[PDB]
Amino acid sequence: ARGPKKHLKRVAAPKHWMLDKLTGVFAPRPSTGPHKLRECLPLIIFLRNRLKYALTGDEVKKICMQRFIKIDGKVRTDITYPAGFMDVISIDKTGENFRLIYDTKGRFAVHRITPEEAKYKLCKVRKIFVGTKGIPHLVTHDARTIRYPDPLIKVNDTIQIDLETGKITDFIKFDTGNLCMVTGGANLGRIGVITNRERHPGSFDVVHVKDANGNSFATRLSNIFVIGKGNKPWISLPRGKGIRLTIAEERDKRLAAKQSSG
Template sequence: MKTKIMMASRKLKIPRKTNFWSVTPTPATHNKEDSIPMLILLRDYLKLGDKEREITRILNNNMVKVDGKIVKDRRFPLGFMDVLSVETLENEYIILYDRKGKLVAMPNSPNNAGLKLFKVVKKSIVGTGKIQLGFRDGKTIVTDRKDINTSDVLLMKIPGLEIVNVLKMGEGDKAFITGGSHIGELATIKNIEVKKSSVKNMVHLNEGFSTIKDYIYVIGTPKYTFKIPETEAVVDDE
């Protein structure tokens, strides 16, 4: 399904006057407003072709992977923390927010090869006491581990989704801010203020600002830190 480029998500960092048509993301992992359709990413971000048919050819030749799995759908949505690899490119790319809240594709650190961070947003009991965990990107796994809770961030191997490490939110942890006026910034947790009412819990950062817990995405603890590149422009501002 096509969409006029002017109607595409405002979180896309793309020129609005170069192409008339965009593409509507497939309803899948990420919602429409928080995702980059594959066509836009390969054509307008990474400049792998000027025409839709050129991008389609790349996809049909099994040259593109997201989180280690081949993707052929030009409407496939990529969102925060997704990892993209293209056979003809030397670097992998990781999807992040820049400091204006735009989705950008940044060269991924070689230290992150074969790994991805997943934030737990849902936890439920299934079957005979197994735990099902749902993540921010829509994926799920079933595990025996009962020590994992919502807001924890799991370091997992991709594409197999094997748990390597559990990053729990705590004082001194490094975090990426995913919303609010400080979106796209890296900060260190000073303390967590737990509210007794329905008001959202607040997290206070060493950098002198505070934000709600929902916007905190832990990327590092005193024992391990996932390498996050500094967010900057990949394409010119629209």
Template sequence: MKNHLKRIASPRTWVINRMSNTFITRPKPGAHSLEMGLPLGVVLRDQLKLTTTMGETKKLLNNKEVLVDGKRRKDHRYIVGLFDVLSIPALKDNYRVLVNKKGRLVLKKLDSEESNTKLSKVVGKVVLKGGKTQFNLHDGKNIISTEKAKIGDTFVLSLPKMEVKKILFLKEGVTVFLTKGKHAGHSGILKEIKGREATYSEEGQEVDTAKDYLFVVGKDKAEIKIEN
């Protein structure tokens, strides 16, 4: 059953009915970890309720355009994860994958204008010849650019071309979103970074968290809607 996993053993980040059937589709290895991503078919059937069976889901993917970050995807096992933009042009529906305050992956409905923007966190970089750098992003994508950015910074990208519109630097005073930990789904103003630890302020209260859990989403305010 390599293409499936037991519902009861699926990641706690998945919003699904764990008792309806024994097995659920396992996403193909790819851009996101199992914890931070969902199979496209499960998103369409279990979260958006556009279909009731996986057979219907496969038919939908074959007959209608379903876009992830502006590119058509037909594989029901394709993994969709944090901050990905899902679009169904025929229904004029657009969604962004977020983490809610229970630490679950949820779909936030977007207007058409906001669906053209993607935030991607730099998780690695390799210096290339000619003054260019390959930036490895949290969603498995790579961008080669002359931009100056460090690990932890965020690229604001235009979809579907994945062009860098601006860079949000990880530093004191920026707006951050928490992707993991007991404060997942919360956001606030970054106050301090000390080694692997960080402190942010939410509604006047200072909260300690891990630096790795921070995702810069804006300077004075978030570049995208992050309420969930």
């Protein structure tokens, strides 16, 4: 090509969007934004495919141009806006608040949250650097840059940000024993406790996690998002608590329920 591409074929779209094959040739190419193309949920997909509020793209445009949808407290009129992990979507007309959280199947789930929980979000620290006039700066996973952070905050930590002001309220350190969620790879959407961390210089670190049922798994350091301090998460969790269940143990729980009935 002689320049940037502007289209996206429907069969080449990310698989977690759950798009069918016969609707059309194309898929919505997300706009540039805070989140990456392969790890985002465009506003049109969330608004007409997940919630069924609209039937076509024109109705999505009509809904958005009435300034009804707010993302992280700000009105967005772009229907291909890339919304990502730990984003807050507010619709005051229907009195609804949503937070984008992976389910155990590796897909963004329709997760409704209380209006008091809608006032803050969690962000993973990506970079720390000293800018002009010796002012410390912190860069998060959703391209937020924050001045004058706490000196105790380092890379791979988690911060809680008030959406109205965009300022840090408190933070969770990256340590063994804290609760974490997997944001990529084969174990995407699984919640557990960090057990130990393996360091490889000049390469990728590997972290081991164990969930509530005792199952253990391992991922790369870049695929882990610290959620809570200790075992208590700082956000509400979806219907599954991060436990990926197998067919055998599903049969086991069905047998237990059948035995307990009667």
